[PDB]
């Protein structure tokens, strides 16, 4: 893999290590779809906006709000329905890896 994007216009690839070993039937990832009514390059996409306190993702710490999910452990969500992505997380039941992109700020 050559994909890095280390500090570029405020875009960098971030990956966290989570594990599904709780009967919570969830990792604490709350995604939501966007409502686009005009074309401008970007459209729709799965991204996290909220979290479930007490879950793996939440208790992890590295999992912060405002993030765009890209690919799950050996899985890709760049073309699956919201509900579909949820089923995957439930099918995990094992230590899964998260691949999401996060925008960095530029002060001065």
Q: Which residues, in sequence order, are bridge partners of residue 50? A: 30
Structure tokens at 20: 């599904």
Q: How far is CA 19 from the centre of its chain?
A: 14
Whose CA is closest to 48, among 26, 63, 37?
Answer: 63
CA distance 100 to 71: 7
A 10 A CB-CB count for 29 gives 25
Q: Preceding residues of all breaks in the chain (C to N beyond 2.5 angstroms)?
A: none
Q: For the domain made up of 1-108, give the CATH fold.
A: Pdz3 Domain (2.30.42)
Q: Are 9 and 39 in contact (CB under 8 A)?
A: no
Whose CA is closest to 102, among 67, 56, 65?
Answer: 67
- Percent composition of the chain: helix, strand, coil (DSSP 3-state, to 5): 15, 30, 55
Q: Which residues, in sequence order, are bridge partners of residue 92? A: none
CA distance 76 to 100: 11
CA distance 35 to 50: 17
* Cα-based distances in Å from 57 to 22, 28, 64, 80: 12, 5, 9, 21
């Amino acid at each position: 893999g050559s994909h890095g994007y280390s500090d570029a216009s405020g875009f960098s690839l971030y990956s966290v290590e989570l594990f599904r070993e709780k009967d919570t039937s969830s990792l604490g990832i709350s995604i939501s779809g966007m409502r686009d009514q005009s074309t401008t390059g970007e459209a729709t996409g799965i991204y996290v906006k909220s979290l479930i306190p007490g879950s793996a993702a939440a208790l992890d710490g590295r999992i912060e709000p405002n993030d765009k999910i890209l690919r799950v452990d050996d899985v890709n969500v760049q073309g699956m329905a919201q509900s579909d992505v949820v089923e995957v997380l439930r099918n995990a039941g094992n230590p899964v890896r998260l691949l999401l992109i996060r925008r960095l700020p530029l002060l001065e």
